[PDB]
Paper text:
Two-component pathways comprise sensor histidine kinases (HPK) and response regulators (RRs). Once phosphorylated, the HPK transfers the phosphoryl group to an aspartate residue within the receiver domain of the cognate RR. Neither [name] nor CheA4 is capable of autophosphorylation; instead, CheA4 phosphorylates [name] on H51 of the P1 (Hpt) domain. Once phosphorylated, [name]-P serves as a specific phosphodonor for the chemotaxis RRs, CheY1, [name], and CheB2.
To show that the conclusions drawn from the unphosphorylated structure are also valid for the physiologically relevant, phosphorylated complex, we solved the structure of phosphorylated CheA3P1 in complex with [name]. Since the rapid rate of phosphotransfer between CheA3P1-P and [name] does not allow crystallization of the wild-type, phosphorylated complex, we formed a stable, complex by introducing two substitutions, D56N and S83A, in the active site of [name]. These substitutions have previously been shown to abolish phosphotransfer from CheA3P1-P. The structure was solved to 2.8 Å by molecular replacement using the unphosphorylated structure as model. The structure shows clear additional density adjacent to Nε2 of His51 of CheA3P1 in agreement with phosphorylation of this residue. Due to the moderate resolution of the analysis, residues 60–65, 85–97, and 111–121 on [name] could not be traced and were not included in the final model. Compared to the unphosphorylated complex, CheA3P1-P undergoes a rigid body translation of 2.1 Å relative to the RR. This realignment of CheA3P1-P positions the phosphorylated His51 closer to the phosphoacceptor on [name], Asp56. The phosphorylated His51 is facing away from the active site of [name]; however, a 180° flip of this side chain would put it in near linear geometry and place the phosphoryl group within 4.5 Å of Asp56 of [name]. The orientation of the phosphorylated His51 seen in the crystal structure is likely caused by the lack of a divalent cation in the metal binding site of the RR leading to electrostatic repulsion from the [name] active site. Consistent with this, we find very little change in the total buried surface area between the phosphorylated (605 Å2) and unphosphorylated (530 Å2) structures of CheA3P1 complexed with [name].
Author numbering:
A (entry chain B): 1 to 59, 66 to 84, 98 to 110, 122 to 134
B (entry chain A): 8 to 135
């Protein structure tokens, strides 16, 4: 703690909203933000200390990522592969499932 | 919060410009196959950003567009001139909605977009 987190989503607005929420969390910290699959690989290659990856459904990457890092992958939706699944926030629930994945 | 709304105005414009470009290309004389996907992603991005800031009215108007496009993509309904026409009117309505919500930093009343919601609902029922 603080756990190093990476945001993966094609919309910059969504990445910033998640980054703003993690900024308020004392047990989690954002280390990388990526728009595409290839961008997510470049950021992951720069930081090996990444603990959790918050991946969006559509922008393949999950295949390459697991061979690079042991980090827990979590899906975001507005099933198979990732460890857990959280619904995209709307202006709390994410904080619970982020903590449960790191504890196990 | 100032950067979040600035990003909403930016991403919103980038998605709507792409939404308009695909519909205008279909109107010019291009196959649906190459344009059905690009605009679903454009509408899916715009609906997602509005849902995040709690712009319920903007999210609802974008959602019906997604359903009509979804009927073309998933259900296999032909994207006739009428589908393109309603979605082009939706593009201009959502453009006025995006510009208003960005300047006010709050949702729209949606009284002036009630005709479009029924226009979309009319076709969705007619296709189903």
């Amino acid at each position: 703690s603080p756990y190093n987190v990476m945001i993966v989503d094609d919309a910059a607005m969504m990445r910033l909203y998640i980054a703003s929420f993690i900024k308020t969390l004392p047990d989690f910290k954002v280390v990388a933000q990526a728009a595409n699959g290839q961008e997510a690989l470049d950021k992951l290659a720069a930081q090996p200390n990444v603990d959790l990856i918050l991946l969006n459904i559509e922008m393949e990457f999950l295949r390459h990522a697991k061979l690079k890092t042991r980090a827990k992958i979590c899906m975001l939706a507005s099933e198979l592969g990732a460890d857990g699944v959280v619904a995209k926030p709307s202006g709390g629930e994410l904080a619970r499932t982020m903590r449960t994945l790191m504890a196990a | 919060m100032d950067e979040i709304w600035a990003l909403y105005a930016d991403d919103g414009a980038q998605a709507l410009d792409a939404m308009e470009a695909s519909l205008l290309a279909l109107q010019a004389g291009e196959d649906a196959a190459a344009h059905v996907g690009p605009l679903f992603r454009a509408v899916h991005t715009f609906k997602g950003n509005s849902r995040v800031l709690g712009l319920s009215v903007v999210e609802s108007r974008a959602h019906l567009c997604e359903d009509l496009i979804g009927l073309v993509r998933d259900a296999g309904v032909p994207m006739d001139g009428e589908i393109v026409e309603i979605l082009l009117f939706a593009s201009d309505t959502l453009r006025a909605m995006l510009e208003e919500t960005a300047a006010s930093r709050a949702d729209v009343e949606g009284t002036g977009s009630e005709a479009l919601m029924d226009q979309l609902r009319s076709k969705i029922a007619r296709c189903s």
